[PDB]
RNA sequence: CUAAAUACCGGCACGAGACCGAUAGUCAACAAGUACCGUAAGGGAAAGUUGAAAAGAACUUUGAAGAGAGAGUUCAAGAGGGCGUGAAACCGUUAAGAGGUAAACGGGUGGGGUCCGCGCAGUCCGCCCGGAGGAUUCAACCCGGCGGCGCGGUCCGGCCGU
RNA sequence: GCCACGCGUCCAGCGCACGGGGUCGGCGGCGAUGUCGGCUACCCACCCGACCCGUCUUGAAACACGGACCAAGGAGUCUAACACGUGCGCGAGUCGGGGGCUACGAAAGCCGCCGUGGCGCAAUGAAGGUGAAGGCCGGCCGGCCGAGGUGGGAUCCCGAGGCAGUCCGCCGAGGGCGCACCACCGGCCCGUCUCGCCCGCCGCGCCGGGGAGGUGGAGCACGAGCGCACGUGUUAGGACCC
RNA sequence: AACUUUAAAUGGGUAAGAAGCCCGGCUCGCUGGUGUGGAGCCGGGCGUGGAAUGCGAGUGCCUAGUGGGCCACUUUUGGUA
RNA sequence: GGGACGCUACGCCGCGACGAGUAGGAGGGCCGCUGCGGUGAGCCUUGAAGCCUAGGGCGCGGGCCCGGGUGGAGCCGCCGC
RNA sequence: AAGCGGGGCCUCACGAUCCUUCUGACCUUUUGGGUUUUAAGCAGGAGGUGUCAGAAAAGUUACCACAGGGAUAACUGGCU
C-alpha cells in the first residue's frame, strides 16, 4: 500500500537472505593477518623488495 | 535511542496508534507494489506517470565505458588551469595565450554556455559545440582538437 | 584572539625553567561541547562487541 | 571569555548538584552556594571569596588578582580578618566597594561573612 | 603548531587542514553590551512595574 | 460557552534556535537585547533568521553577492548574509567589500581579502553599526535546492510540469504510458 | 598439474564482551539428551543458595514413635538438614471497630484508635537609651608586605598580531 | 451659583482623606500527667450520588464475547531502501565505507601521486546525435556596451520640515536602490511540425548548417550539494504478538 | 411529478476604486475606405481610501486515523404500516 | 558648544484571553527499569539491596524522601549514551 | 458573394498496458567496419477486454473442514 508521494522500489529480500548474510566484524583481525604475512614475507626476501618483480 | 521514539509515548493506549476500527492487519493492500492495474492505479497515475509499458529500442550488451564523454562549460574553464597563468595572459604584451588542455583534467566535450574573459586562450579538447566555438572565436582564441 | 601568551617550560623539581614557547593556535580554536560529545558517543560505539 | 565558559559550565560541571527542585554549586568561591553567572566563582576575572578561617576563630577573604589568570597557584591571595564583627563587616565593604573590585557582591559577602561568625559564636 | 597550524599557515603533517574559523569573535558580551558604541543608540529602559 | 475556535490560537514560530551550539546562542543573546531595545527592524530580521533552521537561511553564492553590489544601496555600505558566504568560480573579477557572515568559505576569505576586502562577525557588526545603518541585508536562493523540483502540484497531471520520484532515469524509467501520445495517453 | 589472497554454526586450545542472570541465558548452571512417554520413526522435562567454620543441637524429660519441652552451638536457629532474604493470593490466631436492603466506591463531615509534633507557658533578630561591669581597646601617625585602578592626560621597557 | 483674578501696549509648605488589592501603634482565655494540635493514611456511623472492567459496535450494565485469585514473564523490535523535517562539518565540491602505515586498543591517528569510485556540477531525444543571452556603431566583417524586463516586495539611502545660533542624534511629507519569494511577459538548450532564403568545404550531391513561427521536456537563465546523526511515514524482509 | 400563459418566499452568480478613472505618445508581421479598430508598452494628473458590521492575513512540506453510521424539525420516494 | 532583593537570560517579571473529548497527532517529564562513559575526596557490617508498615510528608499526576521493623553486602544522585 | 462546413440540429451509440497487422521517411539501430535481406525503433489507424479504468475459468458435498459474521437468514422476543 503507497503512501501519498514517494518512490517505487524493489527490494530484494524475497529470497532466504538471512541465512547468507556477511558480516564483517573479521575485518579488523584480516587486517592484522595481512600484515603480519606481509611482514614475514618481507623478512624471507630480505634483500629483495617487498613488492616483488 | 529507542526512549526517543514514538513507542515510549504510546505505552497505555489499547489501539497503539492504528485505531480501533481500521485495526493494523497484516496486509490489508497486498504486499509490494500490487495493484498497478487495479485498486493502486490511482496512485500509479497520480504520482508515477509513464510507469507501464515499453519504450525505445533494446540494447543487448551495452558497456558504459564507451558513452563516457564528460562534459565542461565555460563557466569553469579558466578554473582547469591554476589562476597564477589568467594573471599573466593579460599581463603579457606579446599575446601569448596560454593552452588549456581539457582532456588532461578529463574532460571531453566543451560547451559553450558560460561568458568567456576577454583574453586569448588555446583550447585543446576532443569535441566542441558549436556555440562553444563561436564564443572562443569571438574572444580571439582558437579550438584545437585532439584524440 | 589578536595575542599569544608566552608559556613558561617547567623543570622537573617544579620550578619555572627559563625556556618559555609561545602558545599554540590550537588552544584559541572554537569550544563545541555538542560537537565534541557528538563524536564522543558516536566514537565510543566502534570499540564494541556484538551480542546475539 | 565569562560568557563563553558559562555556557559550558552550567550544566555539565562536577560542582553542581540537583535534586528535590533545587540547584547548587559546590565550588570553592561560590558564596550563597547557587549555580548563576554572577555568582560563579570560577567563571570570572575577578571574584570574592569569603571562607571561615583554619583555626575556627576569624574569616578569610579571597582575593583573586587578574595578572596570572591561567596560573592559579599565583592569582589568589588570601587575607584573614580576626576583628570584631562591626570592624570585620567594615573591611570587606571597604575592599569591594571602595576598590572597584565586582561591586554587585559586596552585600552578598557581607551577608556570608555575618553568618560564619556567627556560626562561630559560642553556641546557648 | 606542525599537526594543526595556526590560521594563517595550514597544518605541516596533515594533507589539508587548517584551523576553523570563529563565529564569533569577542564572546565577552558583558564588554559588548556597555561598549560606548551601542550604548548611544538604545531608548530609555522602562523599569516600572505597572501591575493591574 | 465560547464560539470560538482553539485550531490555529498557537502561532507556530521560532523562539530559539534548535541548534545546541554555544556560539550561536551568545550571538543569538547580543541580538535579543538589540531587538527589545534599539528601534530599528533589522535587530527584529536578524535575530529572527538567527533562530532559523539550515535550509531557511540556503547559502549565498559569492557572485550573487557581486552582482547585488553591481545594483548596491548606492555603493560605502557593507552586506549583512545570515547564512554561509560560498564562493563562485565563476566569477572572475572581485571588488573589495565590507561583509558580514556567519560562516565563509575559506577559498572566498582568501578572495575577498586579495582584492582589499574586509570580512566581519555579527559581534562586530553590532560595535560597527547596531541599528544596522547603512546595511544591505542578503539572502540565498531560498527555492534553490533540487527538493522543490519535486514539490508543487504532482506530476500525471496536466500542465504540472514536477520532477517525479525515480532511482535512474532512463528510455524505461517512466517514460511509458502516462508519457507517451503514443501509448494511452499524455499530459 | 599448480600454493596466495578466500570460506568455516563440526573438532582441538584459547582470549574477550555497553549480552542474559535460574519462568532469563543452549533443552540441559544440578547423577540432561537424564527421569519419563510412544511398538517405532521420535518427543522430552522439572530441579542453584544453612552457616565464616557443622561448630549439624551433647545431656534431661513426655510420648510406642513420629513429634515436642528444657539445655547447648553460632553474631544470628528470627540460618535447625529442599535450611539466605520469605512478598501476594489463601489460611490460623491476638488487638480494635462494625454488622436485617450482597459486598465494595466518590464527595462532605463526625466519632474512635494509632503513633507523631518530643508543643505544656510561646518568637526572636537588628538600631537607640540606662546603669552595672570586663578589656589591652578606637581614631590619627611610623614601618613592612599584598592587592586594585590609572585618562602617568601620551612614564619607560618587553611580547604578540586572525 | 460660578473650574472667573493681575499690570502695560496694538487691532510654597502643613496636616485630612469613599484616592495605584488589609490593617490594628486591639484584645480574652487555657496549656505536665492529663491537656492542645495532627490535611493524608487505620477503623466505624450518616446524607447525597453511584450498574463490572476490557472489546466489537450507530447503540453495552446487558439475557453480546474474555475474565476465580495472586506472583513472574508477556507483544511496533532489528537490517536494507526511499521521502520529508531538524542538528553538525565542509562547500562546487563532498565522502573512505574498500586497502595500506603507526589491557583498554577489534580503539584512535595518518595516507588524496591510495579520490579509483558514489552523489552533485547539463539536459534532451527511442536513437544516431545535439547540447544552454544579445544589442549598438562604421564599412558579412572590425570596435563598443556587455547578463532580460514589469508589478508587488521585509530591510537599507537622501532630506521640504520640525525636535541670534553650529554640531550629534531623533523622527519626518515625499523621493530611490531594491534581499528572498509570487504573478506575468520575454530570451536561450534538445525532440517534433510547418515555411523559406540561402551559403560553404578535404571528397560541390538525395550533401553540412543557419533562420522564422507553434508545440513536447523531470531543462538553462550568477550554484547547493556531499558526509554523519536524529525523528516521522511507506515498504521488502518472521516484521506489533498468537 | 413526467401540462402550462402567469408566478412567489427561501436561494444561486457579479459589482460596491489606487490592480480605479482621465489624458498624451510609441510598437504591431493582427484588421483595414481613413494614425480605421484592437492589443501591448510607456510618461503624466487625479487619495473625502468612495456601503454597514466584524476579524491579522497569506503560503509551503510531512502526515495518522476515517471511508459499517444513527437520531431530531421541515420537504420527500417505496411500502397499509 | 554610605545605600534591601535581583540575572540557573534554557532565568526572572507584568498584562489580558482561554481551558470538553473517542480515533489520531505533537510537546514536556527533577516519572520509573536495566547496563556503559564521565562525575559526587558519594553512601555502606556503628548495617547495602530487597520486603513489611495504624507514622511524618512532598508533587495535579507518573512517583519520591524520611520514621519503625526484618535483612545481611552491596547501592545511589547529576551530565550524556 | 457575404459566408458555412473539418460529420449527422443538440442532449447517447463506445475501449488502457502487452502482443499482432497496415501505412508514412532520401528517418535511427541491427553492434569491429561496409553492402543487402531480416529484425528492432518513431508517428498515425485498426484486431478488446459489455464484470464496459480492461483475470484466461464447470459442478457437487446429506462425509465435509477453517477464519469469522447477529453487518446476514431458520426459532422466541420487539414495531406494523
Not at chain 6, 560597527?128 to 504532482?154: C, I, M, Q
Amino acid at each position: 500500500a503507497p503512501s501519498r508521494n514517494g518512490m517505487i522500489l524493489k527490494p530484494h529480500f524475497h529470497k532466504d537472505w538471512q541465512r547468507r548474510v556477511a558480516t564483517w566484524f573479521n575485518q579488523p583481525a584480516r587486517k592484522i593477518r595481512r600484515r603480519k604475512a606481509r611482514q614475514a614475507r618481507a623478512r624471507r626476501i630480505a634483500p629483495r623488495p617487498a613488492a616483488g618483480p | 535511542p529507542s526512549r526517543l521514539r514514538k513507542t515510549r509515548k504510546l505505552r497505555g493506549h489499547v489501539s497503539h496508534g492504528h485505531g480501533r476500527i481500521g485495526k493494523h492487519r497484516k496486509h490489508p493492500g497486498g504486499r509490494g507494489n500490487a495493484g498497478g492495474m487495479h485498486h493502486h492505479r490511482i496512485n500509479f497515475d497520480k504520482y508515477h506517470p509513464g510507469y507501464f509499458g515499453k519504450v525505445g529500442m533494446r540494447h543487448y550488451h551495452l558497456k558504459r565505458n564507451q558513452s563516457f564523454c564528460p562534459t565542461v562549460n565555460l563557466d569553469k574553464l579558466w578554473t582547469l588551469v591554476s589562476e597564477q597563468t589568467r594573471v599573466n595572459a593579460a599581463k603579457n604584451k606579446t599575446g601569448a595565450a596560454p593552452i588549456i588542455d581539457v582532456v588532461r583534467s578529463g574532460y571531453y566535450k566543451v560547451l559553450g554556455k558560460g561568458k568567456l574573459p576577454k583574453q586569448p586562450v588555446i583550447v585543446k579538447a576532443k569535441f566542441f559545440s558549436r556555440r562553444a566555438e563561436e564564443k572562443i572565436k569571438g574572444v580571439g582564441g582558437a579550438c584545437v582538437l585532439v584524440a | 584572539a589578536c595575542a599569544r601568551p608566552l608559556i613558561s617550560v617547567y623543570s622537573e623539581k617544579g620550578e619555572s625553567s627559563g625556556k618559555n614557547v609561545t602558545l599554540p593556535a590550537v588552544f584559541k580554536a572554537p569550544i563545541r561541547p555538542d560537537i565534541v560529545n557528538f563524536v564522543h558517543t558516536n566514537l565510543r560505539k566502534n570499540n564494541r562487541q556484538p551480542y546475539a | 571569555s565569562a560568557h563563553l565558559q558559562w555556557m559550558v559550565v552550567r550544566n555539565c560541571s562536577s560542582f553542581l548538584i540537583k535534586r528535590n527542585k533545587q540547584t547548587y554549586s559546590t565550588e570553592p568561591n561560590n558564596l550563597k552556594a547557587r549555580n548563576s553567572f554572577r555568582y560563579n566563582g570560577l567563571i570570572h576575572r575577578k571574584t570574592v571569596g569569603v571562607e571561615p578561617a583554619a583555626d575556627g576563630k576569624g574569616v578569610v577573604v579571597v582575593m583573586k588578582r587578574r595578572s596570572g589568570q591561567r596560573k592559579p597557584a599565583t592569582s589568589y591571595v588570601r587575607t584573614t580578618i580576626n576583628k570584631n564583627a562591626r570592624a570585620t563587616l567594615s573591611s570587606i565593604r571597604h575592599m569591594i566597594r571602595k576598590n572597584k573590585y565586582h561591586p554587585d557582591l559586596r552585600m552578598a559577602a557581607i551577608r556570608r561573612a555575618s553568618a560564619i561568625l556567627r556560626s562561630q559564636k559560642p553556641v546557648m | 603548531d606542525d599537526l594543526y597550524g595556526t590560521w594563517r599557515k595550514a597544518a605541516s603533517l596533515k594533507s589539508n587542514y587548517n584551523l576553523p574559523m570563529h563565529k564569533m569573535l569577542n564572546t565577552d558580551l558583558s564588554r559588548i553590551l556597555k561598549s560606548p558604541e551601542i550604548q548611544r543608540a538604545l531608548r530609555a529602559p522602562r523599569k516600572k512595574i505597572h501591575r493591574r | 460557552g465560547v464560539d470560538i475556535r482553539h485550531n490555529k490560537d498557537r502561532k507556530v514560530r521560532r523562539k530559539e534556535p534548535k541548534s545546541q551550539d554555544i556560539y550561536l546562542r551568545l550571538l543569538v543573546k547580543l541580538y535579543r537585547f538589540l531587538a527589545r531595545r534599539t528601534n530599528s527592524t533589522f535587530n527584529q530580521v536578524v535575530l529572527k533568521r538567527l533562530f532559523m533552521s539550515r535550509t531557511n537561511r540556503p547559502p549565498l553564492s559569492l557572485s550573487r553577492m557581486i552582482r547585488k553590489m553591481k545594483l548596491p544601496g548606492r555603493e560605502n555600505k557593507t552586506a549583512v548574509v545570515v547564512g554561509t558566504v560560498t564562493d563562485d568560480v565563476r566569477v572572475q573579477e572581485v571588488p573589495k567589500l565590507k561583509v558580514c557572515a556567519l560562516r565563509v568559505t575559506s577559498r572566498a576569505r582568501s578572495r575577498i581579502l586579495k582584492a582589499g576586502g574586509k570580512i566581519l562577525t555579527f559581534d562586530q557588526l553590532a560595535l560597527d553599526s547596531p541599528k544596522g545603518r547603512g546595511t544591505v541585508l542578503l539572502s540565498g536562493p531560498r527555492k534553490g535546492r533540487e527538493v522543490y523540483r519535486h514539490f508543487g502540484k504532482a506530476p500525471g497531471t496536466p500542465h504540472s510540469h514536477t520532477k517525479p520520484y525515480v532511482r535512474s532515469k532512463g528510455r524505461k524509467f517512466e517514460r511509458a504510458r502516462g508519457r507517451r501520445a503514443s501509448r494511452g495517453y499524455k499530459n
